[PDB]
Design a protein around this ligand. Structure first.
Ligand SMILES: COC1=C(OC)C(=O)C(C/C=C(\C)CC/C=C(\C)CC/C=C(\C)CC/C=C(/C)CC/C=C(\C)CC/C=C(\C)CC/C=C(\C)CC/C=C(/C)CCC=C(C)C)=C(C)C1=O
Ligand SMILES: CCCCCCCCCCCCCCCCCC(=O)OC[C@H](COP(=O)([O-])OCC[N+](C)(C)C)OC(=O)CCCCCCCCCCCCCCCCC
Ligand SMILES: CCCCCCCCCCCCCCCCCC(=O)OC[C@H](COP(=O)([O-])OCC[N+](C)(C)C)OC(=O)CCCCCCCCCCCCCCCCC
Ligand SMILES: CCCCCCCCCCCCCCCCCC(=O)OC[C@H](COP(=O)(O)OCCN)OC(=O)CCCCCCCCCCCCCCCCC
Ligand SMILES: CCCCCCCCCCCCCCCCCC(=O)OC[C@H](COP(=O)(O)OCCN)OC(=O)CCCCCCCCCCCCCCCCC
Ligand SMILES: NC(=O)C1=CN([C@@H]2O[C@H](COP(=O)(O)OP(=O)(O)OC[C@H]3O[C@@H](n4cnc5c(N)ncnc54)[C@H](OP(=O)(O)O)[C@@H]3O)[C@@H](O)[C@H]2O)C=CC1
Ligand SMILES: COC1=C(OC)C(=O)C(CC=C(C)C)=C(C)C1=O
Ligand code: SF4
Ligand code: SF4
Ligand SMILES: [Zn+2]
Lengths: 157, 43, 313, 174, 198, 384, 340, 83
């Protein structure tokens, strides 16, 4: 087909496939939910298998997984690093301590959620969110990206 | 009502010691094969 | 034709360059009890193309920093590495140069700048220092790297890489000169900033501020180099059998030896912790340079008193 | 009882042995052999969507509110599930239903607040609130994670068959 | 019932007198808890002297400081109760020396006696506000850089008075007075019936 | 000495604003910053009942999830003068040790990842994984179990766990052996680790190191042998003391306690008694659910225990165990109320970090990375 | 229909303003949602940009304060459901470029008239319509002339609908200030009449936003056509140089006939991807600011304007070279004010 | 609407959250389910009500079905018992 609509959608998809197949994460590793992510990186549940690299610096990172309490002192940093990433960037909040406040919600030093400091795309629940659950959450980010249609909106704009 | 307990007579024995094996070609023998290779190569 | 012969010798290497990252992310995997990337495409074959497209699409942040240099550094890194494949004598070379190994030594030396330029270009008190590590080690390892070649040449008779195919028609130059092969292999590991010798960028260099397209170009460069240096080991020390009647068994064995030695630095990476910055220079200036300079003299003496002075040409 | 982890002649045989170790990198080659060995071992990873990592009956996972077979919801709003929740997650307010029975008008588990301790599972006298097996409930928006009585009751109806099997397996232990 | 070994209760009691005699000054109310634990109590001025004797005495070597803490009894005139828990590797024993400090009456620092205290003393200042003279470098260890107020004081609100969010207008994180969306439910738990003390 | 504010994502557990002044590649002074993970754990506990503060302890240092819980347990049991039942004690030592392995696999393999060796982590994280599964099949949670409660364990072991904690133990050794063939004698591990961060014996006691860090310097102190807690007295193990204390020696010590813990686990499987896993005092331990659903005194005791609490008698205690990192102690002051008054957690780690300054002197940037590893710093325990 | 305002005034509090805001993704918009969210108002943000782009707005709103509904301008039904449950509708729908599928008249006049018609049907208490300052049906730039046509129509679809009419806006991410500063790439910075006789009065974005928000919560504004203007006027010359001044980049004002220059705008306009300059822009830029004669805006609506020099440092800092970024505004020289 | 009847009026704001979305409500509304439960006839004056399954039920209570006038209803199951 040559209708430019079918010409575009297809192109967008390719773009989405590339970003969704290779997501390079970065793990601030606040707290413990970091241990449950290292497990994902580990052999039972290989993250790489999916195209997720075990480690990445902020410049080269597609997704930031905030694992653990985002305390008030670390809150300015989180932002900095979120602000130091590329134009196509995403945030997967991991842990009840970062989805909301978690056990430490009423504390004076804990931000009640990272979505008060960085926009969050997928919220993975559980105190130590199971590694399979993170993997489920990373896979749902992949379905979120697949649906994104950036060029078709350009074309229809 | 049953309670998970060690099997009767106890379990078998486990290893708690490193079993790393000190296996290697002896040094003189190692050097001789190498020097012999260079001598043949030079000739 | 010559143009076609430029596509071949380039694309083919670029496509192979992409498949090395994949065979790195799987061989490291199986060594660490994990499948590695197999879900995108079949058995992960489409995996290298996928992040290439993700890398180019993401914003070249160009943080900000001196721009021109930020764009000369990756261009130089890819240009020199792909350029050094121009003279490799896989069977017949493409551009046969009478002083070929000096071309390879000189072109490698120029890549140290890209590290220096990228480090200065990012405006980071810390990144700037990171480039210093690589630039210093590169020239350092270059000094033994060059002397090790001079020992070789004196037993080959010329600087042209094409002569070694005639020098190694009866025996690999590993048998003789094995002591330097090892020292060429370790130096090849340093100059490609691979693991045992990858302090640079271990944490603490010249990719810090580099993302998307610039990241990719050096990136591509490193891996192409990873191959090229391994290929130079597979011509200079492991001489593939050459039959003038059928030239491809030379390239077939060149293919096999290059892949295995390329596999070896992948295997080295997973197997060893990274050396300390001074530990690294302690090796070259203390452990290797005295060995190399002395074995250099032995290779000016072996020819003369064994009446084996090599035939020029 | 103690042990010395690292507490410690020069003979050609010995030295030549030691010098070869430094010169030809003998121990380094030993390390390479180990990794080559595993390269040949079967990888332990599981296809995540197709094959799932095993979880036994006590896995706490995602909250659900059960119902009596008849169809009457088990909770009778004693509200000690609220009392023992460590994170203050469960909010319960109740009033006598027209039937005259005691039921919760609003039961809200804030899952982002919840740290999945499993004490609520423990505390309930009628065992109305249970830790359900599902762990995959990641949500695009923060509001979806906050759960009211209708989501939990719906969660309870969906997973009741497995919840009943899980409680069946572990109740003797408790 | 715990497996009490009276053998201990006595030996530690005997040491408690020993110390009380050795330092009649600065030491009062020395008592061995029913938990086979000694808790010499010293006047705040005896901080340096009592510790040093325990760190360097042949019959009582208490080389490492397990912990330095400050309970806060608001009722007590001297609000804080600095407690130093010390361990004897040689005698396989432990002792507690606890002093009292009010908010603006500083205690001496023992960084000299044990350098372990360099950090814990900073921790006590940050949380409770007690000040330690002669400290090498007192400065907040746990609280935020701009935090106002000492948090573990019983008179400090749990949620605190400030919380942080990112504001686009100013493109920077910004404190605001705390506004909570579900206040901490303050369950009253004490029962109006006591337990006849054994 | 240009401050590099070296730190946050660095090579620490997320938070180390390790601000450092470095003349080129030499470290002149290290002033670690802390509190990037302060969360209020000590103040929050004052507002919670004893049983609802148990989950906080698992989060204090969560690599060592349970061993921490044992310290609060012991502390609350002492204040009540109640002691667990015999089977529960062995359990706590069984899962106490399994947890030590879990911590050492974390400490040794994460140490290497920062050094640059990455294959040991994947090798042993698979073994870790297998252990987590024990936790899950005993507690319900992979980590953050809440299994060890103040009066014993929560629920008896599933019918079959012991057998599997055997198969694993029977093999784990080889897995430690492998790591060894990769790092103990690597011609390169030794260099980056040997003679780095040597700590004298007198200085280690002075700065309150109290852990492998002391044991590595040759001081013989294992609170598990010196002051036995639970039934660690009935087992027989050898403390792995070290000489020429340095990063390499202590490492060897941590690999040796992984070995010695397998010796303690074996015994626990061989000799765990038939019995109950929680004190029979409904006063302290919650009544069994069959009992609370058929007996009035049990419901009343279930209702009061869950809603109000233990009501510990007034007193204060400092109880220290030998958590994998080092001495973990809880000073729990308690009024007669059901909710504690103070609970300072002594973290093996607040003392160790402080030593970073006195250990990393005249050292390169890479040396600092090696020393943070040899202290097993989990910022949860330090920040509390 | 109302929501008693309870709370202390910050996030997690209630103000009772449910408001559809169709063009929130915009530079002005971003700010409008900021205050509305800060105040605690219920904000419904219709969007047709992809979800990734709308993410920045999520964090300033409290939980449940912001609802994002999809919407298409050509599809009348989408506007219908957006205003279903809103009681305040704010229209910020404009684009200075004329895109292939939406012509200047359609975005400025057709889309607002339909939107206003919908809320009269819905029963929204008040509608705020935003049109550019100095806008007359026989003016120079079509954009402005059209916008002028628009303010009229919407009055008939929605009577007593407030019509704030802002001047070109000064703010980070604005064009007025960044555009000129970005002339750096151009070696020479063309300025019609050498940047003279086009006195301009900028207005900080926030002032505009706060003003707009205050309108939503004040009975005094009905049928009012306020004009947020600014705290000081300027001949385009000082503005241009000043900008270059803070940016610390050289200035070469070059005279170039607007005749020929309208052509340069045409050139960029030709470009497919968001033309940087617009024929309609050019005229606008050299379209002199009109003296305030309409209803007073800022101050009148409760916010004291903020001088340009005060916050200019923040807007132009990124335009600056690596060096000179620590240069601060008070050591630098503030340009003179020409009221003319 | 729902078990309790939570509902939003036309003028009611706070109903927008459902716009283009769905609300969580329950079929099998319990209010009517026990009413649908037959009256457990018994012989004895008093009867128990484990809830069914003992440990897997409710803390046992004994109901006095002593007056046919009223079918005792265990406060936990809402099950009416017909003497
Ligand atoms: C810390 O530094 C880092 C590494 O090295 C240590 C990494 O390993 C990694 C992980 C990355 C990888 C190993 C995989 C990346 C692979 C690629 C970029 C492949 C790129 C391939 C191409 C450009 C192919 C191009 C082909 C053509 C033009 C063909 C033309 C006809 C990261 C993220 C990193 O940051
Ligand atoms: C198949 C590919 C090789 C696999 C190697 C790893 C698997 C086998 C492991 C064996 C093992 O663990 O023991 C090793 C053992 C381990 O040593 P060790 O430390 O146990 O003790 C032996 C040495 N003594 C006893 C003296 C201390 O090392 C050796 O046996 C000697 C290895 C010499 C290596 C010399 C450098 C490499 C060769 C360079 C010259 C070129 C060779 C050819 C190059 C390619 C040509 C095409
Ligand atoms: C090939 C033709 C090369 C022609 C120039 C040769 C070098 C002359 C000096 C250039 C550097 C100083 C100068 O006057 O230019 C300023 C320019 C400024 O470029 P720039 O803007 O990237 O550097 C500063 C960046 N800021 C200001 C943001 C920090 O110098 C350069 O372009 C970088 C040096 C390379 C110059 C061109 C090299 C071409 C490729 C050579 C290989
Ligand atoms: C980017 C810069 C680095 C690029 C990679 C490194 C290039 C190194 C070139 C080395 C010099 C060429 C050489 O050594 O041999 C060229 C050869 C002459 O040698 P030979 O074949 O022995 O001649 C007699 C027998 N035939 O035959 C020739 O003389 C061919 C003519 C000379 C070609 C030299 C290389 C030309 C490169 C052109 C692009 C240069 C870009 C420089 C960019 C930086 C700014 C100047
Ligand atoms: C008549 C005869 C005339 C000739 C006489 C010849 C006499 C016999 C030969 C003598 C020299 C033999 C060895 C030469 C190479 C080794 C030189 C050397 O000493 O290595 C340096 C270093 C030493 O280790 P270290 O402990 O740091 O130093 C101790 C002393 N300071 O070692 C290292 O640190 C190595 C680190 C290596 C990291 C990567 C390891 C990769 C291992 C696998 C690849 C091995 C090479 C494969 C080569 C394939 C073919 C090219
Ligand atoms: N900044 C300025 O130059 C000034 C502007 N104004 C007025 O204020 C209003 C806001 O200004 P500003 O924020 O700069 O404008 P923007 O250029 O930021 O655009 C405002 C919004 O309008 C939306 N929009 C544009 N075209 C369409 C369309 N065809 N259908 C649906 N939505 C559309 C855009 O959404 P999306 O991009 O997602 O499609 C954008 O979010 C403008 O309408 C303008 O008339 C007044 C004075 C100065
Ligand atoms: C030994 O310390 C470290 C951690 O704790 C184990 C981390 O979580 C992290 C975070 C990294 C991941 C992959 C969670 C780093 C970098 C680290 O150095
Ligand atoms: S959520 Fe549970 S696990 Fe993740 S950080 Fe907070 S506490 Fe640790
Ligand atoms: S405890 Fe069980 S029954 Fe009592 S309220 Fe909480 S949930 Fe409903
Ligand atoms: Zn019943």
């Amino acid at each position: 087909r040559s209708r430019a609509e079918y010409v575009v959608t297809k192109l967008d998809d390719l773009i989405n496939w590339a970003r969704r197949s290779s997501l390079w994460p970065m793990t601030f590793g606040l707290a413990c939910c970091a241990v449950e992510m290292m497990h994902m990186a580990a052999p039972r549940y290989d993250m790489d298998r999916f195209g997720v690299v075990f480690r990445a610096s902020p410049r080269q990172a597609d997704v930031m997984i905030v694992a653990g309490t985002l305390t008030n002192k670390m809150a300015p940093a989180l932002r900095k690093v979120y602000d130091q990433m590329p134009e196509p960037r995403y945030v997967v909040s991991m842990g009840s301590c970062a989805n909301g406040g978690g056990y430490y919600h009423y504390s004076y030093s804990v931000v009640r959620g990272c979505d008060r400091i960085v926009p969050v795309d997928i919220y993975v629940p559980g105190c130590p969110p199971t590694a399979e659950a993170l993997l489920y959450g990373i896979l749902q980010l992949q379905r979120k990206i697949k649906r994104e249609q950036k060029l078709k909106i350009w074309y229809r704009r | 009502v049953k309670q998970d307990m060690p099997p009767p007579g106890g379990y078998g024995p486990i290893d708690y010691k490193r079993n790393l094996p000190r296996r290697g070609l002896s040094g003189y023998s190692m050097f001789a094969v190498g020097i012999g290779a260079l001598i043949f190569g030079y000739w | 034709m010559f143009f076609i012969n430029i596509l071949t010798l380039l694309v083919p290497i670029l496509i192979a360059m992409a498949f090395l990252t994949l065979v790195e992310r799987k061989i490291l995997g199986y060594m660490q009890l994990r499948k590695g990337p197999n879900i995108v495409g079949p058995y992960g074959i489409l995996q290298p193309f996928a992040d290439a497209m993700k890398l180019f699409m993401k914003e070249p942040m160009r943080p900000t920093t001196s721009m021109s240099l930020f764009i000369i550094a990756p261009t130089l890194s890819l240009t020199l590495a792909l350029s050094l494949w121009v003279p490799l004598p896989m069977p017949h070379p493409l551009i046969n140069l009478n002083l070929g190994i000096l071309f390879i030594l000189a072109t490698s030396s120029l890549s140290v700048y890209s590290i220096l330029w990228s480090g200065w270009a990012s405006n980071s008190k810390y990144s700037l220092f990171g480039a210093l590590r690589a630039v210093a080690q590169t020239i350092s390892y270059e000094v033994t790297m060059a002397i090790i070649l001079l020992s070789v040449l004196l037993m080959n008779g010329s600087y042209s890489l094409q002569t070694l195919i005639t020098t190694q028609e009866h025996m690999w130059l590993l048998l003789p000169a094995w002591p330097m092969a090892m020292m060429w292999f370790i130096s090849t590991l340093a100059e490609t900033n691979r693991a045992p010798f990858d302090l640079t960028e271990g944490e603490s260099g010249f990719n810090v501020e580099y993302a998307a397209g610039p990241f990719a170009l050096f990136f591509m460069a490193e891996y192409t180099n990873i191959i090229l240096m391994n290929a130079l080991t597979t011509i200079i020390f492991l001489g593939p059998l050459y039959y003038i009647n059928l030239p491809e068994l030379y390239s077939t064995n060149f293919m096999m030896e290059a892949l295995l030695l390329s596999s070896t630095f992948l295997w080295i990476r997973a197997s060893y912790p990274r050396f300390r910055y001074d530990q690294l220079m302690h090796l070259l200036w203390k452990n290797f340079l005295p060995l190399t300079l002395a074995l250099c003299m032995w290779h000016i003496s072996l020819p003369i008193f064994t009446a084996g002075v090599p035939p020029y040409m | 009882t103690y042990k010395y982890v690292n507490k410690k002649e020069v003979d050609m045989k010995s030295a030549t042995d030691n010098a070869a170790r430094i010169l030809m990198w003998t121990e380094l080659i030993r390390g390479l052999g180990m990794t080559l060995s595993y390269l040949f071992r079967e990888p332990a990873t599981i296809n995540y969507p197709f094959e799932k990592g095993p979880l036994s009956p006590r896995f706490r996972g995602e909250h659900a509110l059960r119902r009596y077979p008849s169809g009457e919801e088990r909770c009778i709003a004693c509200k000690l599930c609220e009392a023992i929740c460590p994170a203050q997650a469960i909010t319960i307010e109740a009033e006598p239903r027209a039937d005259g029975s005691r039921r919760t008008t609003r039961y809200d588990i804030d899952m982002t607040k919840c740290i999945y301790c499993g004490f609520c599972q423990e505390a309930c006298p009628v065992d109305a609130i249970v830790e359900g097996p599902n762990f995959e409930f990641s949500t695009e928006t923060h509001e979806e994670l906050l759960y009211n009585k209708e989501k939990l009751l719906n969660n309870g109806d969906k997973w009741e068959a497995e919840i009943a099997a899980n409680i069946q397996a572990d109740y003797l232990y408790r | 019932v715990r497996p009490r070994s009276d053998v201990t209760h006595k030996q530690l009691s005997a040491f408690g007198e020993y110390v009380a005699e050795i330092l009649p000054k600065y030491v009062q109310q020395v008592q061995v808890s029913c938990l086979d634990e000694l808790e010499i109590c010293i006047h705040p001025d005896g901080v340096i002297p009592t510790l040093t004797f325990l760190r360097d005495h042949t019959n009582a070597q208490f080389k490492s400081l397990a912990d330095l803490t400050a309970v806060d009894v608001p009722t007590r005139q001297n609000r804080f109760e600095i407690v130093y828990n010390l361990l004897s590797l040689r005698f396989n024993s432990r002792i507690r020396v606890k002093t009292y400090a009010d908010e603006l009456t500083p205690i001496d620092s023992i960084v000299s006696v044990h350098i372990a205290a360099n950090w814990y003393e900073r921790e006590v200042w940050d949380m409770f506000g007690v000040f330690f003279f002669n400290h090498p470098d007192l400065r907040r260890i746990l609280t935020d850089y701009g935090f106002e107020g000492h948090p573990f004081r019983k008179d400090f609100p749990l949620t605190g008075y400030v919380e942080l969010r990112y504001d686009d207008e100013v493109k920077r994180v910004v404190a605001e007075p705390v506004e909570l969306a579900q206040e901490f439910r303050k369950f009253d738990l004490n029962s109006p019936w006591e337990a006849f003390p054994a | 000495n240009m401050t590099l504010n070296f730190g946050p994502h660095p090579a620490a557990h997320g938070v180390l604003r390790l601000v450092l002044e470095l003349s080129g590649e030499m470290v002149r002074k290290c002033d670690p910053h802390i509190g990037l993970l302060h969360r209020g754990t000590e103040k929050l506990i004052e507002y919670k009942t004893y049983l609802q503060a148990l989950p906080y302890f698992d989060r204090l240092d969560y690599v060592s999830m349970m061993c921490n819980e044992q310290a609060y347990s012991i502390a609350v049991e002492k204040l009540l003068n109640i002691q667990p039942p015999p089977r529960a004690q062995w359990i706590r030592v069984l899962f106490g040790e399994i947890t030590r392995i879990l911590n050492h696999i974390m400490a040794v393999t994460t140490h290497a990842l920062d050094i640059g060796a990455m294959t040991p982590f994947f090798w042993m994280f698979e073994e870790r994984e297998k252990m987590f599964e024990f936790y899950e099949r005993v507690s319900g949670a992979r980590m953050h179990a809440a299994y060890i409660r103040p009066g014993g364990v929560h629920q008896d072991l599933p019918l079959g766990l012991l057998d599997d904690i055997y198969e694993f133990s029977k093999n784990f050794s080889l897995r430690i052996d492998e790591v060894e063939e990769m790092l103990t004698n690597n011609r390169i591990w030794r260099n980056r680790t040997v003679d780095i961060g040597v700590v004298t014996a007198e200085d280690a006691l002075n700065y309150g190191f109290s852990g492998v860090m002391l044991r590595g310097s040759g001081i013989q102190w294992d609170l598990r042998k010196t002051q036995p807690y639970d039934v660690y007295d009935q087992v027989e193990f050898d403390v792995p003391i070290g000489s020429r204390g340095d990063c390499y020696d202590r490492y060897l010590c941590r690999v040796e306690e992984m070995r010695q813990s397998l010796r303690i686990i074996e015994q626990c499987l061989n000799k765990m008694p038939p019995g109950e896993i929680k004190v029979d005092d409904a006063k302290v331990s919650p009544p069994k659910r069959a009992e609370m659903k058929t007996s009035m005194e049990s419901l009343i005791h279930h209702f009061k225990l869950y809603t109000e609490g233990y009501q510990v008698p007034p007193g204060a205690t400092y109880t220290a165990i030998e958590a994998p990192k080092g001495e973990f102690g809880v000073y729990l002051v308690s009024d007669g109320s059901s909710r504690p008054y103070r609970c300072k957690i002594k973290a093996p780690g607040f003392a160790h970090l402080a030593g970073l300054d006195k250990m990393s002197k005249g050292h390169m940037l890479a040396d600092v990375v090696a020393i943070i590893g040899t202290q097993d710093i989990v910022f949860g325990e330090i920040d509390r | 229909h109302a929501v008693i305002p309870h709370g202390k005034g910050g996030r997690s509090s209630v103000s009772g303003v449910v408001a559809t805001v169709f063009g929130a993704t915009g530079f002005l918009g971003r700010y409008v949602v900021n205050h509305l969210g800060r105040m605690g108002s219920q904000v419904i943000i219709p969007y047709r940009c992809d979800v990734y782009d709308i993410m920045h707005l999520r964090l300033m709103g409290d939980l449940g304060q912001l609802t994002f509904l999809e919407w298409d301008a050509r599809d009348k039904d989408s506007i219908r459901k957006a205003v279903q449950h809103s009681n305040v509708v704010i229209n910020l729908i404009g684009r200075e470029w004329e895109t292939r599928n939406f012509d200047f008249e359609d975005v400025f006049v057709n889309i607002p008239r339909a939107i206003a018609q919908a809320s009269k049907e819905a029963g929204v208490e008040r509608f705020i319509h935003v049109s550019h300052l100095n806008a007359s049906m026989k003016s120079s730039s079509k954009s402005l002339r059209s916008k002028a046509v628009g303010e009229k129509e919407v009055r008939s679809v929605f009577p007593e609908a407030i019509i704030i009419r802002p001047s070109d806006i000064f703010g980070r991410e604005d064009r007025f200030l960044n555009h000129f500063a970005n002339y750096r790439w151009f070696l020479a910075v063309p300025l019609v009449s050498l940047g003279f006789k086009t006195v301009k009065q900028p207005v900080y974005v926030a002032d505009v936003s706060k003003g707009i928000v205050n309108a939503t919560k004040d009975p005094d504004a009905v049928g009012k056509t306020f004009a947020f203007t600014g705290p000081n006027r300027y001949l385009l010359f000082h503005l241009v140089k000043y900008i270059f001044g803070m940016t610390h980049r050289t200035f070469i004002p070059y005279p170039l006939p607007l005749f020929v220059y309208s052509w340069i705008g045409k050139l960029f306009g030709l470009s497919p991807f968001e033309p940087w300059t617009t024929k309609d822009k050019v005229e606008r830029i050299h379209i002199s600011d009109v003296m305030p004669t309409d209803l007073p805006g800022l101050e009148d609506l409760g916010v004291q304007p903020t001088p340009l020099e005060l916050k200019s440092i923040e807007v132009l800092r990124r335009h600056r070279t690596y060096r000179w970024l620590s240069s601060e505004i008070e050591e630098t020289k503030p340009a003179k004010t020409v009221n003319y | 609407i729902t078990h309790t009847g939570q509902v939003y009026d036309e003028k009611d704001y706070r109903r927008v959250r459902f716009v283009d979305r769905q609300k969580e409500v329950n079929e099998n509304f319990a209010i009517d389910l026990i009413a649908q439960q037959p009256v457990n006839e018994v012989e004895h004056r008093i009867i128990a009500c484990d809830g069914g399954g003992g440990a897997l039920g409710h803390p046992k209570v004994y109901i006095n079905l002593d007056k046919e006038t009223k079918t005792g209803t265990c406060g936990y199951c809402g099950l009416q018992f017909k003497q």
